[PDB]
Each structure stands twice: as C-alpha cells, then as structure tokens.
Design an enzyme around this catalytic site. Sequence first.
Site, PDB file in Angstrom:
ATOM      1  N   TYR B  57      16.041  -9.421 -11.525  1.00 33.48           N
ATOM      2  CA  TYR B  57      14.831 -10.213 -11.703  1.00 33.48           C
ATOM      3  C   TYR B  57      15.093 -11.257 -12.791  1.00 33.48           C
ATOM      4  O   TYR B  57      15.424 -10.895 -13.915  1.00 33.48           O
ATOM      5  CB  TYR B  57      13.692  -9.271 -12.070  1.00 33.48           C
ATOM      6  CG  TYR B  57      12.293  -9.817 -11.970  1.00 33.48           C
ATOM      7  CD1 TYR B  57      11.579  -9.758 -10.780  1.00 33.48           C
ATOM      8  CD2 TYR B  57      11.665 -10.358 -13.086  1.00 33.48           C
ATOM      9  CE1 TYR B  57      10.285 -10.251 -10.697  1.00 33.48           C
ATOM     10  CE2 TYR B  57      10.365 -10.846 -13.021  1.00 33.48           C
ATOM     11  CZ  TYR B  57       9.675 -10.780 -11.820  1.00 33.48           C
ATOM     12  OH  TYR B  57       8.369 -11.243 -11.765  1.00 33.48           O
ATOM     13  N   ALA B 179      -1.592  -3.462  -3.235  1.00 38.06           N
ATOM     14  CA  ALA B 179      -2.654  -3.767  -4.177  1.00 38.06           C
ATOM     15  C   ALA B 179      -3.116  -5.205  -3.982  1.00 38.06           C
ATOM     16  O   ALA B 179      -4.313  -5.477  -3.886  1.00 38.06           O
ATOM     17  CB  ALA B 179      -2.207  -3.532  -5.614  1.00 38.06           C
ATOM     18  N   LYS B 359       0.092   3.732  -7.011  1.00 38.75           N
ATOM     19  CA  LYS B 359       0.364   2.980  -8.243  1.00 38.75           C
ATOM     20  C   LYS B 359       0.339   3.961  -9.395  1.00 38.75           C
ATOM     21  O   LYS B 359      -0.550   4.795  -9.462  1.00 38.75           O
ATOM     22  CB  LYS B 359      -0.654   1.867  -8.444  1.00 38.75           C
ATOM     23  CG  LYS B 359      -0.434   1.003  -9.728  1.00 38.75           C
ATOM     24  CD  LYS B 359       0.837   0.120  -9.684  1.00 38.75           C
ATOM     25  CE  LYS B 359       0.720  -1.054  -8.709  1.00 38.75           C
ATOM     26  NZ  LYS B 359       1.992  -1.849  -8.619  1.00 38.75           N
TER      27      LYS B 359
HETATM   28  N1  LIG Z   1       5.488 -13.484  -6.364  1.00 39.97           N
HETATM   29  C1  LIG Z   1       4.470 -12.974  -7.044  1.00 39.97           C
HETATM   30  O1  LIG Z   1       3.558 -13.758  -7.760  1.00 39.97           O
HETATM   31  C2  LIG Z   1       4.237 -11.492  -7.040  1.00 39.97           C
HETATM   32  C3  LIG Z   1       3.092 -11.002  -7.671  1.00 39.97           C
HETATM   33  C4  LIG Z   1       2.579  -9.764  -7.296  1.00 39.97           C
HETATM   34  C5  LIG Z   1       3.208  -9.030  -6.300  1.00 39.97           C
HETATM   35  N2  LIG Z   1       4.334  -9.513  -5.689  1.00 39.97           N
HETATM   36  C6  LIG Z   1       5.023  -8.772  -4.613  1.00 39.97           C
HETATM   37  O2  LIG Z   1       4.141  -7.958  -3.847  1.00 39.97           O
HETATM   38  C7  LIG Z   1       4.749  -6.711  -3.569  1.00 39.97           C
HETATM   39  C8  LIG Z   1       4.150  -5.559  -4.377  1.00 39.97           C
HETATM   40  O3  LIG Z   1       2.847  -5.789  -4.871  1.00 39.97           O
HETATM   41  P1  LIG Z   1       1.866  -4.553  -5.225  1.00 39.97           P
HETATM   42  O4  LIG Z   1       1.848  -4.310  -6.714  1.00 39.97           O
HETATM   43  O5  LIG Z   1       0.651  -4.889  -4.454  1.00 39.97           O
HETATM   44  O6  LIG Z   1       2.688  -3.334  -4.567  1.00 39.97           O
HETATM   45  P2  LIG Z   1       2.118  -1.960  -3.987  1.00 39.97           P
HETATM   46  O7  LIG Z   1       0.717  -1.809  -4.368  1.00 39.97           O
HETATM   47  O8  LIG Z   1       3.019  -0.863  -4.546  1.00 39.97           O
HETATM   48  O9  LIG Z   1       2.288  -2.067  -2.365  1.00 39.97           O
HETATM   49  C9  LIG Z   1       3.541  -2.263  -1.718  1.00 39.97           C
HETATM   50  C10 LIG Z   1       3.397  -2.669  -0.245  1.00 39.97           C
HETATM   51  O10 LIG Z   1       4.660  -2.860   0.379  1.00 39.97           O
HETATM   52  C11 LIG Z   1       4.660  -2.214   1.637  1.00 39.97           C
HETATM   53  N3  LIG Z   1       6.027  -1.891   2.072  1.00 39.97           N
HETATM   54  C12 LIG Z   1       6.948  -1.099   1.429  1.00 39.97           C
HETATM   55  N4  LIG Z   1       8.080  -1.075   2.169  1.00 39.97           N
HETATM   56  C13 LIG Z   1       7.896  -1.838   3.274  1.00 39.97           C
HETATM   57  C14 LIG Z   1       8.719  -2.154   4.352  1.00 39.97           C
HETATM   58  N5  LIG Z   1       9.953  -1.672   4.420  1.00 39.97           N
HETATM   59  N6  LIG Z   1       8.242  -2.979   5.351  1.00 39.97           N
HETATM   60  C15 LIG Z   1       6.957  -3.487   5.288  1.00 39.97           C
HETATM   61  N7  LIG Z   1       6.145  -3.174   4.213  1.00 39.97           N
HETATM   62  C16 LIG Z   1       6.609  -2.363   3.222  1.00 39.97           C
HETATM   63  C17 LIG Z   1       3.754  -1.000   1.446  1.00 39.97           C
HETATM   64  O11 LIG Z   1       3.252  -0.444   2.648  1.00 39.97           O
HETATM   65  P3  LIG Z   1       2.884   1.119   2.848  1.00 39.97           P
HETATM   66  O12 LIG Z   1       1.491   1.374   2.258  1.00 39.97           O
HETATM   67  O13 LIG Z   1       2.883   1.422   4.287  1.00 39.97           O
HETATM   68  O14 LIG Z   1       3.908   2.036   2.156  1.00 39.97           O
HETATM   69  C18 LIG Z   1       2.676  -1.624   0.586  1.00 39.97           C
HETATM   70  O15 LIG Z   1       1.738  -2.325   1.353  1.00 39.97           O
HETATM   71  C19 LIG Z   1       6.191  -6.852  -3.985  1.00 39.97           C
HETATM   72  O16 LIG Z   1       6.892  -7.335  -2.867  1.00 39.97           O
HETATM   73  C20 LIG Z   1       6.103  -7.843  -5.134  1.00 39.97           C
HETATM   74  O17 LIG Z   1       7.303  -8.518  -5.411  1.00 39.97           O
HETATM   75  C21 LIG Z   1       4.849 -10.726  -6.048  1.00 39.97           C
END
Ligand SMILES: NC(=O)c1ccc[n+]([C@@H]2O[C@H](COP(=O)([O-])OP(=O)(O)OC[C@H]3O[C@@H](n4cnc5c(N)ncnc54)[C@H](OP(=O)(O)O)[C@@H]3O)[C@@H](O)[C@H]2O)c1
EC number: 1.3.1.104
Lengths: 364, 364
Positions: B57, B179, B359
């Site tokens: 990262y 989330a 989470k």
């Molecule tokens: N660029 C930005 O500004 C930024 C900011 C925030 C978040 N993000 C991104 O958003 C994601 C996590 O955010 P969060 O905190 O909301 O995470 P989270 O609450 O832990 O949720 C993760 C999600 O990813 C899905 N997932 C996991 N493995 C997968 C796969 N192999 N194929 C398809 N879906 C899959 C999960 O589905 P299931 O429920 O089925 O397990 C779940 O919906 C990450 O990719 C992160 O880098 C990026």
Amino acid sequence: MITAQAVLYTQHGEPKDVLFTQSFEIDDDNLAPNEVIVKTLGSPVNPSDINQIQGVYPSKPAKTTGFGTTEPAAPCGNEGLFEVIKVGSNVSSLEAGDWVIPSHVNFGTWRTHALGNDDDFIKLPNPAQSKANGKPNGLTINQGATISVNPLTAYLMLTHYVKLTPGKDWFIQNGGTSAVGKYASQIGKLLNFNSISVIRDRPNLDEVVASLKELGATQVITEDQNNSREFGPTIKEWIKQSGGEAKLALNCVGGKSSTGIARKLNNNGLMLTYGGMSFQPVTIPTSLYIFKNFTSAGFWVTELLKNNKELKTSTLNQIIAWYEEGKLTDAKSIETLYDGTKPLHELYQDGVANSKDGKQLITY
Amino acid sequence: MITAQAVLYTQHGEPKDVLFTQSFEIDDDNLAPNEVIVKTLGSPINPSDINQIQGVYPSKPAKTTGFGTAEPAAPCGNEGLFEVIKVGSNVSSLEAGDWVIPSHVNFGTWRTHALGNDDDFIKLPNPAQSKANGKPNGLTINQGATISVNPLTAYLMLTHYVKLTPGKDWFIQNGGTSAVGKYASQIGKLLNFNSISVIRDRPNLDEVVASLKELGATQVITEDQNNSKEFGPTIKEWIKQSGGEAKLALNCVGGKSSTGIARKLNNNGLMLTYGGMSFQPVTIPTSLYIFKNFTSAGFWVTELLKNNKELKTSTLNQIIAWYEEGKLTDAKSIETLYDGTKPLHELYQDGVANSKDGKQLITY
Ligand SMILES: NC(=O)c1ccc[n+]([C@@H]2O[C@H](COP(=O)([O-])OP(=O)(O)OC[C@H]3O[C@@H](n4cnc5c(N)ncnc54)[C@H](OP(=O)(O)O)[C@@H]3O)[C@@H](O)[C@H]2O)c1
Ligand SMILES: *O([C]1[C]([O])[C]([C]OP([O])(=O)OP(=O)([O-])O[C][C]2O[C]([N+]3=[C][C]=[C]C(C([N])=O)=[C]3)[C]([O])[C]2[O])O[C]1N1[C]=NC2=C1N=[C]N=C2[N])P([O])([O])=O
C-alpha cells in the site's frame, strides 16, 4: 510457566554471523484440550539446516515475532527427538514420557521446548515401550533424533527408483563416510545389494575402510581410485564375478567424483544426486549420455514425501523395526550437552564449525 | 506519566507474523502549548491497514525509533476514535472529554494513547454534546471509529462525480454487502436514487437481499445474474420502467464482476473503481468505450481529501448529522476489548485472522 531457549536468526547468512539465542515463555499450566508440550532431548546439525540459515534452501520456516522478538525471526533445525511432558485433556495419541519427532519440516528443532498439537508430532517407541513390546533393543537418543531424514533418504534412494536384484546387482555411492552413506551401506547389506563406497583419502584410511565394510560396503575405494582409468577394469572384474550389474549411482559430492561414479555404471544406468558437498556442479561426459544411455536425476526426501504420507510411514516403520531388532545401527554423532552455562546458539555454531569432524548432535 | 502500548512492525509482512507490542511512555506533565494527549476508545481493522503492514500500500507511516524500539518501527491503523484527556496551554479547539478522529492518514490508531498537536485531530460530537444540542441520537463508539473512510467514500462516489436525477436515475455497485456498499444503499435511499447491488451468492441469499433492500437497494442480484445473458433484458426492463438511466457503476471487485456492471450502464456511463478482490483487473469490453461513451476512473478518499479540507468537512458533517438524526446506520462490528491481560498486538492479529466473521473493532 516454562522458560525456554530458541536459536533464531532475523536475516539469512552464515550461522557464525546471524544466529542468536532468544528466551521465551511457554504456558505449561492449563493446556488447551489438543495441545502438547515437549522438551527437546536432542537435535542434530544437518547440511540442510545450515543451507536453510544461509538462505540457499527453498523450504524454510516463516520469519515471525512469535518467540517474543521485535524483528521477525526464524527458528532453526528440521530434525530432532523430543519427550512429551504434558498433554491437554483431549489428547490420547500422546502421554507424558513419550518420545516424538516433528511430523513436518520447518518445525525449528534447535531449541529447548515447544508447544504444539498432537498432529505436529510422530510417536516413536521409547526404550521402555520397546522392551515391554518384547523387542531385544530400544532406540538411543541419537538414533531417535536422526531417524527422520538420513535413514529414509538412504532407504528410498535404494528402493524407490531402480530394482536391484538381491545377491547380484550393485550401487555405487560417493560421500561414503557421510551419515547417509553409512545408512546406505547398512541397508545395502540388509537387502543383499552389493555396493562400492567412494571416500576421500585420509591418514586413518584403513580404519575407515574397515568401519564401512563392517557396515555393509562390499568395496571401499578412494576418490583417487575413482578418478583412475587404470583402476576401472578392476571394478569391472568385481561386477562380472558377481553375475550382476552396477545399476545405480548415489551422488552427494558433484564435480569429478560425480563423473567417476557415473562411468562405473553399466549401460542404462541411473544416478541420483541428493547433495553437493563441494560447490562443484554435476559433471558427466557427453559419451555416457549418448553411448551408454546414462540418466542423471535428482532426489529430495522433503519433496518426495510431501504428499506421500503412506510412503513416509512405511519407510520410518522399517527403520524403527530394524533398530528394535538390532539389525541397524546409527551413524554416530559427536554429542554436545546444553546445560545453561554457554548460550544455546553457540553450541550450534560450534557444531556447524565442527561439521568436518562428523555428524553433530546437540543434547539436552 | 502514562505507560501506553502500540502495535508496531520493524519489517513488512503478514500481520500474523510481523506484529508486536511496544510499551512506551507519554509524559502528560510535559505538554507543549499546542499539544494534546488522547486515549483510544476504538479502532477498526480495515483492508488498507493490513495492506499497509504487508508493504503493498503506497501510503504508510515512516519507520522510526520514536516508540523506544532499537530498530526503526512503524505503527498500524489509519482510522480510530479517541478521547482527549489533556491539552496544552494554547489549545482552544479541543478540551478534555472531547471525541476526535485523526485529521490525517498514517497516524497509527492501533494503540492505547497518542501525543499530537491539536491540528492532528478533528472533533466529533460526543454523545453528551449531541444530546445537549437537541439531537435524538449521539454517535456510538463504532460509528465514530469508522466514520472517516467508508461513509465518506460512499457519499462522495455518489454525489461528487455524476449527477443522478432523483426519483429516476440509477447506480449499480458490486460488493453489495461491503460496509461501503451498505452505506451507498442507504445514501441512495436518502437522496432518492435507484440502485442495483450485485452480491456473491451465499446460503442465506434471500435474507441478505431483503436486508439490503431495507437499507435502500432497489434490486439485488447475484454475480451469476450479473454474468447472465438470459437475465440481462430483465434489468433493462427495470431501468426503462423507471424513466431514468444507469449512469454510475461503483466497482470494488474487478474481473468479471466489473465487466458485468459496466455492461448494465446506459450510454455516457461512468465507473469508479475504489477496490479490487483477488488481484483481478478491471475488465471492460472495448465496444462500451468506443460505442457507448463509457469512462472508467478511480476513487481514493485519502487522495481526494488530501488537499480539500472543505469537501472533507462538508461530507463528514453530513454523515454526523445523519447519525444524530437516526437516518444512517453502521454494520455491527465484532468488538474485542483490551484490558491489559493479553498483548494488544495479539488482539489485532486475531482480528485480522477473523476478518471473514465481520468488521473487527478493538475497543479500550
Ligand atoms: N479507494 C478507496 O477510497 C477505498 C476506500 C474504502 C474502501 N475501499 C475498498 O473497498 C473494499 C473494502 O471496503 P469495506 O471496508 O467496505 O470492506 P468489508 O466491509 O470488509 O467488505 C468486503 C467486501 O468484499 C467482498 N469480497 C471479498 N472477496 C471477494 C471476491 N473474491 N469476489 C467478490 N467480492 C469479494 C465481500 O463479500 P462477502 O460478504 O460475500 O464476503 C464484501 O462485500 C476494499 O476493496 C477496499 O480497498 C477503497
Ligand atoms: O567426506 C565428506 C563426507 O563424506 C560427506 C558429509 O557427511 P555428513 O554426515 O556430515 O552429512 P550427511 O548428513 O550424511 O549428508 C550430507 C550430504 O547429503 C545431502 N543430503 C542429505 C540428506 C537428504 C538430502 C536430500 N537431497 O534429500 C541431501 C546434503 O545436502 C549433503 O550434501 O561429505 C564429504 N565431503 C565434504 N567435502 C567434500 C566431500 N567429498 C568430496 N569433496 C569435498 N570437498 P569426509 O568423510 O569428510 O572425507
């Protein structure tokens, strides 16, 4: 709580430079149901252990802070004998007083104690159990501590690749004074294979030749004899008299030594390279490949047994049985006892430095 | 004096391997004029926190010896809720008892306490202050601890890039149970945007569909349906009936999922990629770019809000207000409390290993 010691490194390099001792705590009160605590009885120094530390051996333990360090650190040693001192309430496979080895590589055996599960270990019969089960012999600590790599290596190379006709065929091996060489000679005798051991010349040559012949080598030659065009026909006579053929070569040296043992095979021969005790590459004359149909291959006991647990078990059982029957003896180790006055890592560093004297076993 | 604990690493690697706990002292009797000391109330484990520790990262705290380590070490965690416990002689913006989040990334929130300047923090209303200001709810610890990344990410993706006509236009998003996904569904409801959430199939699929619909998703489909040529005309029917258009795709998955949501947009569509599972690249058919005026871009809240305090402020204020008003809800974190009996880094290692359960919030 038990205060244990582990030999660790945070960076790959020579053992004399990178090893240190880390004191860590294990909770021996209130074990989880499947947990097992063991104390080391002994662990050897094998070349693979050293190569692991040096960073030139592609199978190694993770570097972690789990021994209470701030920098990620790896433990050392893949082989060792441990005594079970306490088991959790759901453990029946193991009990206090039992002898065990690690079930998998990368365990970290250069240390005083460990806490794992019962699936982290394989039970060996302890002397008391062997005698109670009506065996004329039980294992020694050196025999238990070195049972897992070198005897299996010798056994599998001799049995798993080409079928030598008992009472007739030959194998030829270099590094004849190695622990593996000594197991091969004995296993050869037990299976009725003829063999030639190649060794480096030394002042006490006669004493060594005698030891190896007693172990089971049919003939012992020097590396100078191995190199010798003049001597070749003498070896040919031996093999002709036997009615058999030299079908298999075992190479742990490389260089000219590997050349010499290959040349001594009959046509359609196989060589297994399992080590390289000088940095010299495996060197084979073009003519052996083209005109004698020679084949050169590798052997790596860790890779062979990875998804071959039945084969591991069967091989180990044979070695145990042979020891219990008095038919096999150990490649002897020089033993150094840890007692707390000299840091554990220094015992192992001395062991690494005294490799040339012979197999080293740190005891506890 | 305060004896605090911080979760640190001296080398990048997997959290399970490289994390340790470091005791460090904060002299609360020696605050400089603009300095503030805070006590952590709670901090979550986010994927970006883990990626930071792993070394993949590109935004991360420097390794220093400032926590009293022998070797340079970095702290962990970017998001957290803290309580101000003491302020310096020139601090007016914060008082003891106030709730704060870090004002910037890379602060290191996996720890018990921190010493910083007043401008290293952003004040949030504590429950007593929300209540005194006439609001029907105050923030929970989990809400305050997770307000900085995910809610803001959802809101800005929805409002800062393309203008969806209320009562008719659509966004489509994958990672619908994430989330961010769950915030996006709620914000969609609040702003009267139609939306399709794409989710992975699971045993309780129908129950999850219904929960997402309660949050604000108009329709929810599986990834199988996203892939489906057969199913595609049904989605077109939904959009045509609404009188609106699908103008915005939110992608946190990549690969086939990204292809599928992009194909569901009308002409002039925009995709925002803010995440990516399994290292699968964003994969978009050429025809959409050429014949449907499709655009594909990125979203990173850290970078968007780096030099834009005003947008950050306005967005954070809307999220806070919605929590106070009871209009927005967080997903339930699994909370592990630090009491000083188990090393703090082990709580976070467990939380990393148990990511799949939900989470993870470490509280204090
Ligand atoms: N660029 C930005 O500004 C930024 C900011 C925030 C978040 N993000 C991104 O958003 C994601 C996590 O955010 P969060 O905190 O909301 O995470 P989270 O609450 O832990 O949720 C993760 C999600 O990813 C899905 N997932 C996991 N493995 C997968 C796969 N192999 N194929 C398809 N879906 C899959 C999960 O589905 P299931 O429920 O089925 O397990 C779940 O919906 C990450 O990719 C992160 O880098 C990026
Ligand atoms: O000649 C030397 C010895 O004969 C020999 C070393 O003996 P050892 O007991 O210390 O070592 P071992 O544990 O038996 O094994 C060493 C080699 O085998 C390889 N190995 C073992 C098990 C499993 C694997 C595998 N692939 O599954 C591999 C291991 O990597 C080692 O290579 O070496 C002899 N030696 C030393 N230097 C030499 C040499 N011969 C020729 N030329 C040079 N320079 P001695 O008795 O001292 O004269």
